[PDB]
Amino acid sequence: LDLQPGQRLARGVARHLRAHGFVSVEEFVPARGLRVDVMGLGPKGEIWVIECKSSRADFQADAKWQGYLEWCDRYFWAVDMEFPAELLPAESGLLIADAYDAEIVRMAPEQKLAPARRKVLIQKFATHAARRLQALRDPEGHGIFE
Amino acid sequence: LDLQPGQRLARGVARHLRAHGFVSVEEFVPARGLRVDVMGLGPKGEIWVIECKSSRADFQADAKWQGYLEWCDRYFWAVDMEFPAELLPAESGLLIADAYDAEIVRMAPEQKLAPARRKVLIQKFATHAARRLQALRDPEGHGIFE
Ligand code: NA
Ligand code: NA
Ligand code: NA
Ligand code: NA
């Protein structure tokens, strides 16, 4: 695997979400100026944001993480077993992950999204997923201006 | 390309939808016992069903096509330039397609979906897209029991 450390965690997170009836995308943009490492979508439309921190420095750089809260029902960190997990915010959910799997060790508290916002984000997720899929199946089949 | 004839049309349809800000999936299941060749999703949540008929016999077999109507805002046929297009229902939309591109030659009439149904179908589309994407990016990363 030539995946970067964050991509590795996200692979394991995605495997684990899928094993439990969720689906996911990577590098999702809920609003201008924000990007989340993994967005998970539950079978009833539950929205999870998972930030994959591959190092303490990676975590130090996500200082405005509380800004992700308004864009999800549940917010989680995902780190590997070498990460000092006790330093993460107590109120957050937590997964321990690697490139091959993940486990939730602390379930995030539920801060449900309003109906209109849930709609916008599901539409964005759909769009993200379907674009990336089409591009993998048909690499030449789009233009530079979209 | 080792794509079957219907898959070829669907490739061209998908390219063309994407060029105009739509996204798509293939072999979409809106309800038990139905499957549509291409589902298109518009940037405002418009739902299009496109049936890709590669032969007159293919069209003859889609006799219950009026059953697709309740699952979309707009219903289209997609055929190649060798197809006797005049034989298709007058009320339907029409694309002429091949493996490389497509064009709408007749815009389908709008029969808008109810809000609750639009939601269900967008959720299904999201789920379909994201599963297939994850499986292409990580072939081994799921189990046989989902
Ligand atoms: Na992705
Ligand atoms: Na990261
Ligand atoms: Na597909
Ligand atoms: Na077909």
Task: Give strand pairing partners of A103.
Answer: A96
Count of beta carbons in the 10 Å neighbourhood of residue A85: 14
Residues of B in contact with A131 (CB under 8 A): 18, 23
Judging by DSSP bridges, how do beta strands B74-79 and B47-52 pair with one another?
Answer: parallel
Count of beta carbons in the 10 Å neighbourhood of residue A145: 5
C-beta separation of B9 from B98 below 8 A: yes
| Residue pointed to by tokens 């496109």 | B50
Task: Give strand pairing partners of B48.
Answer: B40, B74
Q: Looking at the 3D structure of chain B, how many domains does it have? A: 1
Q: In angstroms, rounded to a whole number, what is the distance separating the alpha carbons of residues B74 and B104?
A: 12
User: Angle CA(B60)–CA(B86)–CA(B70) in degrees, nearest 5?
Assistant: 60
C-beta separation of B45 from B124 below 8 A: no
Q: Which of A13, A15, A18, A121 should we substitute to test contact with B (largest number of B Cβ atoms within 10 Å)?
A: A18
The H-assigned helical ranges of chain A are: 5-19, 56-61, 115-137
Q: Which ligand is nearest to the CA of B54?
A: 4
Q: What is the experimental resolution, given in Å to one decimal place?
A: 1.9
Among candidates A25, A45, A126 on the partner chain, residue whose Cβ is nearest the Cβ of B41: A126
Specify the length of chain B in residues.
Answer: 146
Q: Half-sphere exposure of residue A85, counting CA atoms within 13 Å on the CB side? A: 17
Q: In angstroms, rounded to a whole number, what is the distance separating the alpha carbons of residues A77 and A48?
A: 11
Distance from CA of B53 to the nearest CA of A (A): 21
Domain encompassing residue A88: 1-146
Distance from CA of B141 to the nearest CA of A (A): 6
